[PDB]
Amino acid sequence: LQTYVTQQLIRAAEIRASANLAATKMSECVLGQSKRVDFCGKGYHLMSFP
Amino acid sequence: NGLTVLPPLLTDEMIAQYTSALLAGTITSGWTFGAGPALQIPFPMQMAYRFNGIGVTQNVLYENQKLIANQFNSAIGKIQDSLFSTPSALGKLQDVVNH
Amino acid sequence: SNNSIAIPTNFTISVTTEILPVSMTKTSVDCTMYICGDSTECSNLLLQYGSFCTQLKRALTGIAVEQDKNTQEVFAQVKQIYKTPPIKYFGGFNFSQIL
Amino acid sequence: SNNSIAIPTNFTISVTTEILPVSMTKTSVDCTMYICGDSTECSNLLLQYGSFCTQLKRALTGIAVEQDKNTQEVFAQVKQIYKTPPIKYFGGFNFSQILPDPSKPSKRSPIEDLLFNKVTFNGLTVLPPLLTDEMIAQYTSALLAGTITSGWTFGAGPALQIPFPMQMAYRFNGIGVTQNVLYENQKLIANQFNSAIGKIQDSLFSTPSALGKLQDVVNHNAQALNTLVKQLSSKFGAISSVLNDILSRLDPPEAEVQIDRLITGRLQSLQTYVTQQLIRAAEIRASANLAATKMSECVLGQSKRVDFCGKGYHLMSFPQSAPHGVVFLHVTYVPAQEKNFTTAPAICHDGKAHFPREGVFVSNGTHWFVTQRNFYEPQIITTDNTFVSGNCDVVIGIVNNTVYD
Amino acid sequence: LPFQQFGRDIVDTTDAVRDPQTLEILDITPCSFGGVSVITPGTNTSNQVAVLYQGVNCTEVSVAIHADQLTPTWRVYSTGSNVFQTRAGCLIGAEYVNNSYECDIPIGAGICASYQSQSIIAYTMSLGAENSVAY
Ligand SMILES: *[C@@H]1O[C@H](CO)[C@@H](O[C@@H]2O[C@H](CO)[C@@H](O)[C@H](O)[C@H]2NC(C)=O)[C@H](O)[C@H]1NC(C)=O
Ligand SMILES: *[C@@H]1O[C@H](CO)[C@@H](O[C@@H]2O[C@H](CO)[C@@H](O)[C@H](O)[C@H]2NC(C)=O)[C@H](O)[C@H]1NC(C)=O
Ligand SMILES: *[C@@H]1O[C@H](CO)[C@@H](O[C@@H]2O[C@H](CO)[C@@H](O)[C@H](O)[C@H]2NC(C)=O)[C@H](O)[C@H]1NC(C)=O
Ligand SMILES: *[C@@H]1O[C@H](CO)[C@@H](O[C@@H]2O[C@H](CO)[C@@H](O)[C@H](O)[C@H]2NC(C)=O)[C@H](O)[C@H]1NC(C)=O
Numbered sequence A: 001l002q003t004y005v006t007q008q009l010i011r012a013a014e015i016r017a018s019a020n021l022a023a024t025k026m027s028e029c030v031l032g033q034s035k036r037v038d039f040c041g042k043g044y045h046l047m048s049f050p
Numbered sequence B: 001n002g003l004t005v006l007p008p009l010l011t012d013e014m015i016a017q018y019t020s021a022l023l024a025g026t027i028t029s030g031w032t033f034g035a036g037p038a039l040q041i042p043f044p045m046q047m048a049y050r051f052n053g054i055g056v057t058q059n060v061l062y063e064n065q066k067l068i069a070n071q072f073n074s075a076i077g078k079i080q081d082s083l084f085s086t087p088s089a090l091g092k093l094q095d096v097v098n099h
Numbered sequence C: 001s002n003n004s005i006a007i008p009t010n011f012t013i014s015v016t017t018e019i020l021p022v023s024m025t026k027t028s029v030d031c032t033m034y035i036c037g038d039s040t041e042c043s044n045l046l047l048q049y050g051s052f053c054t055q056l057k058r059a060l061t062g063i064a065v066e067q068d069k070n071t072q073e074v075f076a077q078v079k080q081i082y083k084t085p086p087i088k089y090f091g092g093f094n095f096s097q098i099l
Numbered sequence D: 001s002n003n004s005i006a007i008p009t010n011f012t013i014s015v016t017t018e019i020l021p022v023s024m025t026k027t028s029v030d031c032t033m034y035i036c037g038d039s040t041e042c043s044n045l046l047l048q049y050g051s052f053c054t055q056l057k058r059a060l061t062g063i064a065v066e067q068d069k070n071t072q073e074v075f076a077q078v079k080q081i082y083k084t085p086p087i088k089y090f091g092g093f094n095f096s097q098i099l100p101d102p103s104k105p106s107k108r109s110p111i112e113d114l115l116f117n118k119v120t121f122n123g124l125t126v127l128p129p130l131l132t133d134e135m136i137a138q139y140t141s142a143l144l145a146g147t148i149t150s151g152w153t154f155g156a157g158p159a160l161q162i163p164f165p166m167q168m169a170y171r172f173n174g175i176g177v178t179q180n181v182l183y184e185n186q187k188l189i190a191n192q193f194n195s196a197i198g199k200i201q202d203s204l205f206s207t208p209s210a211l212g213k214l215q216d217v218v219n220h221n222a223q224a225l226n227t228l229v230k231q232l233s234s235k236f237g238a239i240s241s242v243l244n245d246i247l248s249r250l251d252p253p254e255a256e257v258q259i260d261r262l263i264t265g266r267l268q269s270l271q272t273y274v275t276q277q278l279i280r281a282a283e284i285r286a287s288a289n290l291a292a293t294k295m296s297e298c299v300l301g302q303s304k305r306v307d308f309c310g311k312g313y314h315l316m317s318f319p320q321s322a323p324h325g326v327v328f329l330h331v332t333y334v335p336a337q338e339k340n341f342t343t344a345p346a347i348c349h350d351g352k353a354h355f356p357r358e359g360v361f362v363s364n365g366t367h368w369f370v371t372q373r374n375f376y377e378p379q380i381i382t383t384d385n386t387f388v389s390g391n392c393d394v395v396i397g398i399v400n401n402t403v404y405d
Numbered sequence E: 001l002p003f004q005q006f007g008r009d010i011v012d013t014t015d016a017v018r019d020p021q022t023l024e025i026l027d028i029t030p031c032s033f034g035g036v037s038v039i040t041p042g043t044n045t046s047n048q049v050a051v052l053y054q055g056v057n058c059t060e061v062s063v064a065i066h067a068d069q070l071t072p073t074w075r076v077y078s079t080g081s082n083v084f085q086t087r088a089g090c091l092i093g094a095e096y097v098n099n100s101y102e103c104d105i106p107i108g109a110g111i112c113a114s115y116q117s118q119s120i121i122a123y124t125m126s127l128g129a130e131n132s133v134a135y
């Protein structure tokens, strides 16, 4: 059980790191047009759709 | 044996409701609904704003409006097929279950 | 070359994709049932180890609670459930594949 | 509807807070006092397990040392300590709540005091942080007094000077609203600002659960220590939890069996505690990096990222210290009082399409105008604010009118 | 009460006792201890050191040094110029000064030490040069 729980903690940290990036791509690509290069796709960004 | 699995707080229908709300707010309002009240504006004017936002004057859209729309539709058509052929397209989410 | 430039005379509208995991599966574990089963003899011996089990429950509960904040943070971005207009003509664009 | 638009006619200024944890408590744990104590036999037995303690000491030392790189990276953004001039007049904007108060002994601001009042052996000690709470205050004061008398200039070279209303005019110009809108409303906006700050104070009086994020960072330490110091009263299958009793009742050749179980249990507890600390430290550093980014991009400059430095179009921000973290006061711009109109994307005239420079064509029922996109202000059409660019037999929705000269 | 002998604390450890004959209540507290740190410039530059005893007041250090204490690596306290009282603990072998400089060897709550004939000094760190733009 101790091994299992430590593994779950590490994977949870990884998933949180990945879920804090969707929350930003939902604000800078979906709620407005972006200027960061290669952030909302390859090219000059126009809009996005969840 | 003593192991239980819990259901998420939000069902799938609720997540679809949020998705539909977000989609319907970015069609009739552009980006205005993300900073206050939702202001309406016809869609080609919004796309003209979004061309103005990358250093291309408005007229380019108006003189090409019929063409550009076509190029959009074809693209949106192909995605579905691109989600069949490629096996690893959903490689990420799948692993989340498997792992 | 120091006196020559290139300028494009036509464009392209393209649609790409992107997949991102958001949350994973919630679980919860009962020590006594897993380790000792329903034996009354084993639990007395296990009780000599103090608090190796409240820690595990606390950790798993923390993970489970965080898994809901993740989805609440990604999707609950707006506080008004906008509804799509009935007639669907937006200048020549479908959105039928997403609506 | 495919020929109608809505354009706001009156704005709003709002202030919203945001809390971030920055650093956590420094600790140091000594094995032999915890596992063994003063008993020589226990240490002589513990020497057979190799180097299970040097690693623990090194890991905890690394965490403790890192905890001071987190504060040196959020607050130490400047090399000079700026001051504020004696004359506290800034065009009507009132900063009394955020600027330091010399009367009280610790030279904190009233909001900082309010924040500070809202937050609560065996080889387990705590090291003190390097920067005292009266130095974080000086960094915060310098940051606050450099952004009042300079703008964003002091973050990219020598601090240049400029009066406050001119700076706020710059910041309106930075989100697509012309300068004059401020100068004709300078008083109102100032009052519009002054009340918002006041509300903040009350919003922290009544609500006690505002500062949970920092509070957790405290609570998660105490438990982590309490459990540890409790794990010292568990037998782990031996006959007692006190080494002296075993050493005073059993022949030493028959006592290694009893001592081994205690040693293994205590080692296991220490390893668990260290691993949990490592994961929590990783999370805290992940938060501190975001705190540093928000300090660099919202305080030293104006941000174009949506929902980063607040909800709404961005104007500025102000840092305030707190226990084990930081608090930001984002000042944004919210439109209001929308009014409806009829629009069309061109103006045919003499067989030539006409498109505005910046602005959208608007009708009020009989007349036509071109107005800026975020604050209703109509204008008489004129070639000075349009460009021709093409013919009248291609565009759709074009409405024919006249353009004066 | 007339039927208790031992005692405990917020944990499970005896911290009181009743003498079997002179029936009096006695507290129990352990004898002092803590960490030790050595503050040195590099052996290339100099060869002197300073010592920090963590989490004690200087009087209990001086008394124990006069009578008994482990780590007999004793230093010499010439005058009050050696003993100094920080927030972290007693600092033996450094002279506190009045100026302000940059932090070179961090010690405790705002205190830093450096090598400036030459000896070891401990002072209060300085956050930078003062300035004031003329609004
Ligand atoms: C820009 O590219 C598009 C796509 O290649 C061109 O549109 C094509 O034009 C040819 C000309 O006869 C037609 O046969 C094709 O059917 C058009 N494609 C589509 C998808 O309709 C367009 O002509 C190019 N621009 C210019 C100025 O030539
Ligand atoms: C969007 O494009 C699709 C693709 O042609 C259109 O869907 C077709 O519609 C016709 C008549 O309505 C049907 O005969 C086809 O079977 C449809 N195709 C599919 C794949 O279902 C659709 O009509 C377009 N959008 C609108 C509003 O007309
Ligand atoms: C824009 O909104 C502000 C915010 O209320 C309005 O200010 C108030 O205006 C009324 C009458 O116009 C006064 O009685 C109030 O005292 C004003 N409030 C404050 C705080 O001064 C303003 O009038 C609005 N302007 C327009 C053009 O709609
Ligand atoms: C800026 O706001 C402060 C906060 O209210 C004002 O201080 C008030 O001053 C009046 C008049 O002396 C007192 O009756 C209040 O008790 C003060 N408030 C507090 C909280 O002490 C201050 O006057 C404002 N700035 C200016 C220039 O008027």
Ligand SMILES: *[C@@H]1O[C@H](CO)[C@@H](O)[C@H](O)[C@H]1NC(C)=O
Residues within 6 Å of the ligand: C001, C002
């Ligand atoms: C660069 O300019 C010089 C004139 O100063 C010219 O001689 C040279 O050919 C130019 N380079 C190329 C690649 O043409």
Ligand SMILES: *[C@@H]1O[C@H](CO)[C@@H](O)[C@H](O)[C@H]1NC(C)=O
Residues within 6 Å of the ligand: C087, C089, D002, D003, D397
């Ligand atoms: C779009 O505008 C035109 C006017 O050019 C109008 O005839 C048409 O009905 C509008 N579309 C819809 C769906 O009403």
Ligand SMILES: *[C@@H]1O[C@H](CO)[C@@H](O)[C@H](O)[C@H]1NC(C)=O
Residues within 6 Å of the ligand: B040, D004, D006, D338, D339, D340, D341
């Ligand atoms: C647009 O006009 C209609 C009626 O003409 C009205 O119901 C609606 O509220 C107007 N739009 C806005 C944003 O007020």
Ligand SMILES: *[C@@H]1O[C@H](CO)[C@@H](O)[C@H](O)[C@H]1NC(C)=O
Residues within 6 Å of the ligand: D364, D365, D366, D367
């Ligand atoms: C539109 O504005 C003009 C400008 O003075 C005014 O004369 C006219 O009455 C307005 N129309 C309506 C319907 O209010």
Ligand SMILES: *[C@@H]1O[C@H](CO)[C@@H](O)[C@H](O)[C@H]1NC(C)=O
Residues within 6 Å of the ligand: E056, E057, E058, E059, E060
């Ligand atoms: C100084 O030593 C005395 C005992 O002589 C002790 O009671 C006191 O707590 C010490 N000072 C501090 C600040 O701990």
Ligand SMILES: *[C@@H]1O[C@H](CO)[C@@H](O)[C@H](O)[C@H]1NC(C)=O
Residues within 6 Å of the ligand: E097, E098, E099, E124
């Ligand atoms: C140095 O001496 C001055 C004069 O008494 C004093 O005010 C200052 O605090 C001293 N510096 C210290 C104690 O660091």
